[PDB]
Amino acid sequence: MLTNLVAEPFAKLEQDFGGSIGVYAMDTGSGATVSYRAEERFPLCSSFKGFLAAAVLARSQQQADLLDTPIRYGKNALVPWSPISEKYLTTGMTVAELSAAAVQYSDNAAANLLLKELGGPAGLTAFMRSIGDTTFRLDRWQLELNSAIPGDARDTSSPRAVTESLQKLTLGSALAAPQRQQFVDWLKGNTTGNHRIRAAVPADWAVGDKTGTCGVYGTANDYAVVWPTGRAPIVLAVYTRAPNKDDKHSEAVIAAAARLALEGLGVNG
Ligand SMILES: *C(=O)[C@H]([C@@H](C)O)[C@H]1C[C@@H](SCCNC=N)C(C(=O)O)=N1
């Protein structure tokens, strides 16, 4: 009854893109939603790292010393796109610092170290199951998890489940209040999303997000919590893919889909 009260031209947008776009957006005040391909699976790519940091925070509720624990690593941990952890190879970083790097710079070495700590892909999947997400699956470590093969359900979720889980973790009760705010603060400090959902959000609204860019099959994504002033927050996810391995992703398409989602919710920007 409250889903897609106002139609938006998502189909034309994905046709111009040459692929598929999946969108879920939730107005947490009224419960109204915008939904387009929202229950289809799309590759997570690096966007799993946000949920990874939330899983670390959940663990820290029972292990008070976890976040400040210092983690040393060898040069063999430094895989492509490890922009923060490469600067601390000779010193180590704390679990909290690795989590922030994974979220805010999509740092691969940091994500791998944290995934190892949580028991690998199955451990992160188990955390998602524990908050009621039955759709998310992480199956591989990097870098193969980003292969984005058409029809492959490994390392995928749906826009809807991503949004529902993000809501639970940032606004709901899945994390204790201090950890919830820390997760929000990490998302707010993300540096990689300025041309995606944030590009559709007025500068005077708060917003946190996590991006993903698989590098193949036109596959890229972003999810975000947005706090418009004077009304309840909006949670949304925008995922893309495309049929050919060399199809390029588009940041502009993600921003445009986010704009349409906000318009469909009647959120004035
Ligand atoms: C995750 O999705 C990427 C991982 C596979 O390395 C990671 C890398 C950057 S984007 C890499 C190329 N940049 C632009 N096309 C990234 C991100 O910021 O989303 N995540």
Numbering used by the authors: 24 to 57, 59 to 252, 254 to 294
Anything the authors wrote about it?
The KPC-2 β-lactamase is an enzyme that efficiently hydrolyses carbapenems, the most potent β-lactam antibiotics, active against the broadest range of Gram-positive and Gram-negative bacteria of any β-lactam class. In Gram-negative bacteria (such as E. coli), which are leading causes of antibiotic-resistant infections worldwide, the primary mechanism of β-lactam resistance is the expression of β-lactamases, enzymes that hydrolyse the β-lactam ring to abolish antibacterial activity. Our search identified KPC-59 as containing a single mutation within the α2–β4 loop (glycine to aspartate substitution at position 89 (G89D) compared to the parent KPC-2 enzyme); but kinetic characterizations of KPC-59 are so far unreported. Experimental kinetic, biophysical and structural characterisation of the naturally occurring, but previously biochemically uncharacterised, KPC-2G89D mutant with several antibiotics and inhibitors reveals significant changes in hydrolytic spectrum, specifically reducing activity towards carbapenems without effecting major structural or stability changes.
To capture the structures of carbapenem-derived acyl–enzyme complexes, and thus probe why the G89D substitution reduces catalytic efficiency towards carbapenems, the isosteric Glu166 to Gln166 substitution was made in KPC-2G89D and the purified recombinant protein crystallised and challenged with imipenem and meropenem. Diffraction data resolved meropenem- and imipenem-derived acyl–enzyme complexes with KPC-2G89D/E166Q to high resolution (1.09 Å and 1.03 Å, respectively, S17†). Overall, analysis of the KPC-2G89D/E166Q carbapenem-derived acyl–enzyme complexes indicates that the covalent binding orientation of carbapenem substrates is not affected by the G89D mutation. In both acyl–enzyme structures of KPC-2G89D presented here, the α2–β4 loop forms extra hydrogen bonds, between residues D89 and Q87, that are not observed in equivalent KPC-2 complexes. While the meropenem-derived KPC-2G89D/E166Q acyl–enzyme complex contains a water molecule in the DW position, it is refined at low occupancy (0.58) compared to the structure of the parent KPC-2E166Q : meropenem at similar resolution (occupancy 1.00, PDB 8AKL47). In contrast, in the imipenem-derived KPC-2G89D/E166Q acyl–enzyme complex (a substrate for which, compared to meropenem, KPC-2G89D has an increased catalytic rate), the DW could be refined at full occupancy (1.00) with a lower B-factor. However, the existence of multiple conformations of Glu166 indicates that stable hydrogen bonding between this residue and DW only occurs in a fraction of the imipenem derived acyl–enzyme population. Thus, increased flexibility of the Ω-loop in acyl–enzymes of KPC-2G89D can reduce the stability/occupancy of DW, or reduce stable interactions with Glu166, consequently impairing deacylation.
